[PDB]
Design a protein around this ligand. Structure first.
Ligand code: SF4
Ligand code: SF4
Ligand code: FCO
Ligand code: F3S
Ligand SMILES: [O-][O-]
Ligand SMILES: [Mg+2]
Ligand code: NI
Ligand SMILES: [S]
Ligand SMILES: [S]
Lengths: 261, 530
């Protein structure tokens, strides 16, 4: 019973956040769950099903554990829009989250509400701190759609060894979310010089000019994409596409249309 | 006698299975999807160019595929012809997705229905290694299998089983019949595949910007000029070869090995109608230009393949949580949610019920492999013949849960084999100074368009109606909607509901037989409902 216990809940989500975790390197996911933590509940991966895993969750939340929540929590009209084993997702989270030693909201859905919370939000979905704040829950927000695997795993490690990290106003760990994408973008020199691509097929785009005039929201977006990269190889702007602000609260409505400034 | 499995694990999303049992076999079934998000409602009135970004978030497991379907639908309603390099790049990215998706499904989502990890501790490792060496061309040592055994041991002795907690196979289970040596090999490969999948997703990100959730497509083509550098192309190539070798040498051989011990599953989970739109086109306006072909098979009959006709699609809601009971072709799709509780008014799911000419169909790898086999697609013919000769069965064995599982492996293989072709073409184009990725386009005053994608789970289609550069209607009909949706207004069971009838249940408290059939469809509930 040596490794720290982690309980991982899936709510209103696309599971892209769970997948991003599988992309972790140093440690790799096998090292993470065999040597670093004990993954005591995770629906995507577990061998048993039905009643057997619900019993596992019941036992696990009696101990000292960290709670990880993926996806938004539907609260519209009583919250029946999302159910697991007959239970509304709100009730599951309300039971589990307040018991944890610490809670992590992974992905923009869990932090701020995400894609389903975009207008007109038919399920009345909200984020973790908005749903469970009255119960005393104060979650660390790992934002992104999905976040960089290093921002999640780095945060778990930090929690295990150093404690609660310092957060910004939106609950994001300052050690990862302290600067905008734009501050660290290799195309910053073009932006300041006024060197923009005006269409995706122009010589300027082929030359790698700044994408600001094609919609890029880097200047308003807090994340570490340019320096960290994804999958150790790439990131949106390097691949010629504007940033769509995926780590910002309400980005779906506040930063679209995506292809205009 | 009622059995309920909720939650179904090792899938994407929120599924509940209810079954009726009599004499130890399933006599009726209900496929119940229990999360609704409403992406179609959110899309209404928005900019068509935003669509691919919202719809990609339909699902993060089959990432990319909804963005593809959306730019294909908007490309289509606008009449643009994207350049050859965009077509090549998009096909390459889809190939990498097939490679990544099917690997993770077999080992990490499906295998635990067949493999008793705990029994791996009873394996003689030297004997397991020798068996490993008979199964595949790469060399395995006794020592590496001992290490794996040691890792499983630390886990069990720690008392923290983690994801193995309360497994159906703990304390023995009459339906798990693998010899300990095979359980050990499968477990070792399960762990190895966790590292291999990381390489498949990296390959994808070289063109796709990132995984999960790519960011390189636009209406009119692609944006990723950076990936056109010899260096980037060479880096894709090297990762692509490693993942391909693992698929060829470990995945496929593991699949046949395990299947061999479950030959009886060739008589379980039979279904009848199959369809696919095909994938990997040379001509974005002609399904018959596709590397894997479009086609429709009626009632298990492989001698006659009809042409896919998208005019024949209608989605039903009589048994789902939506208003009323009318069915609509997707250009006139309606999304009006209305909850009534489990079985209230007999309604039991947030999925609509897609029907083709009024009939229920199965889509996905088996369906895709059957059509290509019927049409004499040579790569598929060779792969199928190998499975069949290896298992000692005729083609009739394919119409089953065992066949559905084998077909996923074949689909993975035929895609991986072709990827090198598209890559060489892209490279040759670039070397010759042809580096176009984008074509300019303009909105018609008013138009409609449709994008067809054969995703790893099957036939995907996005349907747009736009006026003045604004979305008037945008509907998704997705492979798991077909496979796992509920009954239609005619009361016809869906592929998965029908596949479950007849299923034998050894232990009602641990009904692994239900998981085996459900997992063979590779369910995705966020996809199915959106
Ligand atoms: S934050 Fe994005 S990737 Fe994560 S669950 Fe939500 S939609 Fe999916
Ligand atoms: S491409 Fe985007 S993030 Fe980079 S400099 Fe331009 S506006 Fe800033
Ligand atoms: N593959 C996949 Fe996802 C489903 N079902 C889609 O489209
Ligand atoms: S879209 Fe998201 S992944 Fe980074 S580049 Fe922008 S924050
Ligand atoms: O996963 O679709
Ligand atoms: Mg739909
Ligand atoms: Ni999916
Ligand atoms: S959000
Ligand atoms: S676009």
């Amino acid at each position: 019973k040596k490794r720290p216990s982690v309980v991982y809940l899936h709510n209103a989500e696309c599971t892209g956040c769970s997948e991003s975790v599988l992309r972790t390197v140093d440690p790799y996911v096998d090292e993470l769950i065999l040597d670093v933590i004990s993954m005591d509940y995770h629906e995507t991966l577990m061998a048993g099903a039905g009643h057997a895993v619900e019993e596992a969750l019941h036992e696990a939340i009696k101990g000292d554990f960290v709670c990880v929540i993926e996806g938004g929590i539907p609260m519209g009209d009583g919250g029946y829009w999302g159910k697991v084993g007959g239970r509304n997702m709100y009730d599951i989270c309300a039971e589990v989250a307040p018991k944890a030693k610490a809670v992590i909201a992974i992905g923009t859905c869990a932090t701020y509400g995400g894609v389903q919370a975009a207008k007109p939000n038919p399920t009345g979905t909200v984020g973790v701190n908005e749903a469970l704040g009255k119960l005393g829950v104060k979650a660390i927000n790992i934002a992104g759609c999905p976040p960089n695997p290093m921002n999640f795993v780095g945060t778990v490690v930090h929690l295990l060894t150093k404690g609660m990290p310092e957060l910004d106003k939106q609950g994001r760990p300052v050690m990862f979310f302290g600067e905008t994408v734009h501050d660290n973008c290799p195309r910053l020199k073009h932006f300041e010089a006024g060197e923009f691509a005006t269409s995706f097929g122009s010589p300027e785009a082929k030359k790698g000019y700044c994408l600001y005039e094609l919609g890029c929201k880097g200047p308003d977006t807090y994340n570490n994409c340019p320096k960290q990269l994804f999958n150790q190889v790439n990131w949106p702007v390097q691949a010629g596409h504007p940033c769509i602000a995926c780590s910002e609260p309400n980005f779906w409505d506040l930063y679209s249309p995506f292809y205009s400034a | 006698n009622k059995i309920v499995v909720d939650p179904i694990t090792r899938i994407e999303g929120h599924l509940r299975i209810e079954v009726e049992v009599e004499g130890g076999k399933i006599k009726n079934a209900w496929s119940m999807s229990t999360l609704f998000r409403g992406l179609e409602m959110i899309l209404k009135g928005r900019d068509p160019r935003d669509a691919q970004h919202f719809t990609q978030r339909a699902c993060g497991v089959c990432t990319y595929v909804h963005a593809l379907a959306s730019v294909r639908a908007v490309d289509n309603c606008v009449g643009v012809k994207i350049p050859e390099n965009a077509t090549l790049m998009r096909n390459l990215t889809m190939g990498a997705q097939y490679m990544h998706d099917h690997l993770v499904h077999f080992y990490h989502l499906h295998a635990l229905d067949w493999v008793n990890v705990a029994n791996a501790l009873n394996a003689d490792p030297a004997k397991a290694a020798r068996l490993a060496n008979d199964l595949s061309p790469r060399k395995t040592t006794t020592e590496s299998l001992k290490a794996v055994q040691a890792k499983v041991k630390a886990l069990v002795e720690s008392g923290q089983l983690g994801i193995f907690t309360n497994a159906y196979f703990l304390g023995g289970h009459p339906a798990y019949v693998l010899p300990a040596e095979v359980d050990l090999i499968a477990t070792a490969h399960y762990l190895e595949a966790l590292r291999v999948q990381v390489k498949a997703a990296r390959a994808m990100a070289i063109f796709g910007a990132k995984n999960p959730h790519t960011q390189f497509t636009v209406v009119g083509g692609c944006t990723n000029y950076d990936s056109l550098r010899p260096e980037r192309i060479a880096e894709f190539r090297k990762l692509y070869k490693e993942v391909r070798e693992f698929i060829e040498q470990v995945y496929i051989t593991d699949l046949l090995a395990v299947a061999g011990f479950y030959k009886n599953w060739a008589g379980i989970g039979k279904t009848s109608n199959f369809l696919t739109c095909g994938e990997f086109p040379t001509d974005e306006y002609d399904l018959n230009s596709r590397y894997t072909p479009q086609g429709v098979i009626w009632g298990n009959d492989l001698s006659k393949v009809d042409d896919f006709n998208p005019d024949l699609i209608e989605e039903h809601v009589k048994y789902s949580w939506y208003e009323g009971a009318d069915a609509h072709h997707p250009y006139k799709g309606v999304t009006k949610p209305k909850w009534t509780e489990f079985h209230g008014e007999d309604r039991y799911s947030w999925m609509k019920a897609p029907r083709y000419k009024g009939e229920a169909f199965e889509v996905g790898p088996l369906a895709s492999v059957l059509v290509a086999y019927a049409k004499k697609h040579e790569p598929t013919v060779k792969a199928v013949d190998l499975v069949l000769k290896t298992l000692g069965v005729g083609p009739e064995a394919l119409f089953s849960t065992l066949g559905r599982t084998a077909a996923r492996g074949i689909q993975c293989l035929t895609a991986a084999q072709e990827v090198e072709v598209w890559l060489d073409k892209l490279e040759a184009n670039v070397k010759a100074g042809k580096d176009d990725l984008y074509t300019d386009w303009q909105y018609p005053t008013e138009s409609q368009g449709v994008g067809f994608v054969n995703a790893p789970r099957g036939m995907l289609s996005h349907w747009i109606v736009q006026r003045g550069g604004k979305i008037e209607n945008f509907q998704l009909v997705v492979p798991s909607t077909w496979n796992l949706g509920p009954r239609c207004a005619e009361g016809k069971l869906s592929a998965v509901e029908q596949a479950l009838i007849g299923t034998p249940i050894a232990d009602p408290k641990r009904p692994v037989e239900i998981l085996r059939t459900v997992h063979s469809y590779d369910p995705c509930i966020a996809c199915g409902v959106h």
